[PDB]
Amino acid sequence: RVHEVIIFNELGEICAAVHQKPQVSPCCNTHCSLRNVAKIVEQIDRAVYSIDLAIYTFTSLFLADSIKRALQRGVIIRIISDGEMVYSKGSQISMLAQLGVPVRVPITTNLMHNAFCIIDGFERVEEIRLLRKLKFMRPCYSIVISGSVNWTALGLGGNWENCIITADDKLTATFQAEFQRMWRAFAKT
Amino acid sequence: REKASRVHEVIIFNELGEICAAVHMRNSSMGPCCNTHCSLRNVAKIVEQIDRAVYSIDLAIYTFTSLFLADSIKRALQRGVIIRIISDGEMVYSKGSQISMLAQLGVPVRVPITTNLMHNAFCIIDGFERVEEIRLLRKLKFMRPCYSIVISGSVNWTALGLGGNWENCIITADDKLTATFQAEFQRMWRAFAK
Ligand SMILES: [Zn+2]
Ligand SMILES: [Zn+2]
């Protein structure tokens, strides 16, 4: 399965001249930011039951659109955000909250820098199944995308960022558990 | 089996990190805690990896404020470990930043030229490529036993929970991940400025 480090750096745009968005034409730049973006979005496009998103700042249009498409397929999406940033200027979260996506934020003022996203997490999918009242689910498996606090900027700004995309059962288990924990303990908006 | 026994977990700092502070103080006065989110246990797991380093620690870091972390980097240095820092061009000067102190002890520090954000927060311990480079550079025919460990996560996992913010880092000896992080360190280090 997938187990990969996505790395944004200063070389991400050196191939700009050769360039359901994004549609990335082939290039020879191993550091292509567009390729990085397309890989992340792909994982979202592959969600079938659930997306749990703990995020610090959500300004990316490419990401918001993929979250939008997921909803239309009937993927159950929940967002956890930093309290200060949640409805700051540029935030896509309001838009998503308009479509029915629930959003929770911490009570405490501290920085919520845990930017990760669990797709079809095992514990979460089983949770849906029971509440959805089912026995058989369509086939899927857990993916976590996690890393630097602005990986969800999706290359926006040309910074040095990173996220790991992995199907590792232990890591995906831990992230999903913490989201469940934060979801129960945080406040709605 | 013994390799699969090696460190591979995610460490999470959250608001429950200091819930056990009184339990700890009662024990210290002479009278181990049950908190799964214990922030002290978190930092001990992190610092355990630093103390393990045999040859190299390559640190790509956004902000380095922790005294407790700078201390462990000091022990490694006195153990002979070769430490290198890549930092954010602006945060290197900020309040509480330990970069100057470490640099004065002879740690080489590099920053990017631009004012863009260096939001990488990773640490490679004895990355295979870097140990080989060190072996080749000192004309050695062998090295002591060791293995790659990388710590990587949210922008300020290096504050070590100080501040009680939500932070996280993967700590793993996973071969692919360590090699990938070490390679980006080598690239940046070559590309960057003193
Ligand atoms: Zn390209
Ligand atoms: Zn404790």
Side-chain angles (χ1 to χ4, degrees), chain A residues 1-19 22-125 127-134 136-168 170-187 189, chain B residues 3-140 142-194:
Chain A
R1 308 182 187 183
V2 79
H3 187 71
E4 190 184 352
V5 185
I6 303 312
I7 294 178
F8 299 85
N9 53 32
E10 78 276 16
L11 302 182
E13 297 281 359
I14 68 165
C15 53
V18 317
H19 303 288
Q23 298 286 317
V24 198
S25 295
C27 72
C28 55
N29 181 22
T30 62
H31 300 290
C32 166
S33 297
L34 289 180
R35 187 185 300 111
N36 287 348
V37 170
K39 277 177 176 167
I40 301 177
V41 165
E42 165 84 77
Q43 300 299 321
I44 303 295
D45 293 331
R46 296 177 109 154
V48 4
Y49 289 120
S50 76
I51 299 181
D52 280 342
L53 181 62
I55 199 165
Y56 173 71
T57 175
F58 195 160
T59 57
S60 169
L61 213 57
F62 282 145
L63 217 219
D65 282 340
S66 80
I67 297 282
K68 184 128 65 167
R69 295 195 293 281
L71 213 59
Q72 297 164 5
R73 312 194 299 273
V75 180
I76 298 175
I77 305 173
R78 301 179 308 175
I79 293 179
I80 284 184
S81 174
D82 176 85
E84 227 173 3
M85 301 298 287
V86 59
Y87 295 135
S88 65
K89 182 59 194 168
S91 182
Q92 297 289 321
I93 302 180
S94 280
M95 182 273 284
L96 300 174
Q98 288 182 348
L99 302 171
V101 173
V103 179
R104 307 280 182 88
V105 297
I107 326 94
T108 129
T109 177
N110 285 318
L111 294 167
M112 208 299 288
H113 280 158
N114 280 152
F116 56 90
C117 172
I118 323 101
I119 299 163
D120 296 325
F122 189 75
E123 170 192 1
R124 171 62 175 154
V125 172
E127 166 176 308
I128 291 175
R129 177 175 70 73
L130 307 192
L131 314 185
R132 183 148 281 167
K133 297 287 292 183
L134 290 181
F136 282 165
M137 306 299 269
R138 307 163 99 111
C140 57
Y141 63 94
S142 307
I143 300 294
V144 69
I145 306 177
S146 189
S148 64
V149 293
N150 261 47
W151 74 255
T152 67
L154 274 69
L156 263 49
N159 293 314
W160 301 264
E161 306 276 350
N162 81 258
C163 58
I164 296 159
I165 307 176
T166 183
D168 182 281
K170 182 180 188 180
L171 310 184
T172 63
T174 301
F175 285 110
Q176 181 65 81
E178 174 69 2
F179 186 99
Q180 302 278 41
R181 193 206 60 78
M182 291 191 303
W183 188 260
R184 289 193 267 271
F186 285 2
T189 49
Chain B
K3 287 186 186 171
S5 319
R6 293 173 177 181
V7 67
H8 183 75
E9 63 186 275
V10 22
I11 284 191
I12 300 172
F13 296 92
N14 54 35
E15 74 284 14
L16 304 183
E18 273 142 40
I19 257 277
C20 43
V23 166
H24 280 298
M25 290 170 185
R26 289 193 179 88
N27 283 132
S28 304
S29 66
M30 308 269 87
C33 89
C34 189
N35 187 18
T36 52
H37 310 291
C38 166
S39 272
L40 247 54
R41 196 182 307 162
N42 277 4
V43 320
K45 236 306 181 295
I46 289 162
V47 174
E48 176 187 314
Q49 324 302 324
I50 302 296
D51 294 335
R52 258 177 197 160
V54 190
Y55 292 109
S56 58
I57 305 174
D58 286 339
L59 195 46
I61 216 54
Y62 168 75
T63 197
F64 196 152
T65 63
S66 169
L67 281 300
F68 193 78
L69 211 281
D71 273 350
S72 71
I73 295 288
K74 264 193 281 182
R75 288 172 237 135
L77 207 43
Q78 286 158 10
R79 287 205 316 275
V81 175
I82 310 310
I83 303 157
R84 296 183 302 182
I85 301 182
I86 290 174
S87 196
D88 178 87
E90 301 299 316
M91 296 297 277
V92 61
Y93 308 105
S94 73
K95 49 174 171 296
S97 172
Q98 310 292 319
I99 314 282
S100 290
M101 185 264 291
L102 297 168
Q104 201 59 32
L105 314 178
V107 175
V109 183
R110 289 183 188 188
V111 297
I113 279 301
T114 69
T115 202
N116 290 65
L117 294 164
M118 214 302 292
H119 267 160
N120 291 139
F122 66 80
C123 185
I124 317 95
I125 300 165
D126 298 333
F128 174 81
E129 176 182 20
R130 173 57 176 169
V131 182
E132 248 305 88
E133 174 174 66
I134 294 176
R135 182 186 76 75
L136 295 181
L137 286 191
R138 313 217 171 279
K139 308 315 298 157
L140 303 163
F142 69 100
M143 303 295 265
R144 290 185 267 158
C146 50
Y147 61 92
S148 296
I149 295 173
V150 60
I151 308 172
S152 179
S154 59
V155 73
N156 203 5
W157 68 255
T158 47
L160 297 179
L162 195 51
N165 320 276
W166 294 263
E167 308 277 354
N168 81 267
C169 57
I170 315 281
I171 298 181
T172 189
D174 183 88
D175 182 36
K176 172 197 235 294
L177 294 184
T178 52
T180 299
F181 279 107
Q182 182 66 73
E184 177 68 341
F185 192 96
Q186 305 295 74
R187 199 200 55 77
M188 287 186 305
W189 184 260
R190 272 140 194 172
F192 285 5
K194 303 183 187 189

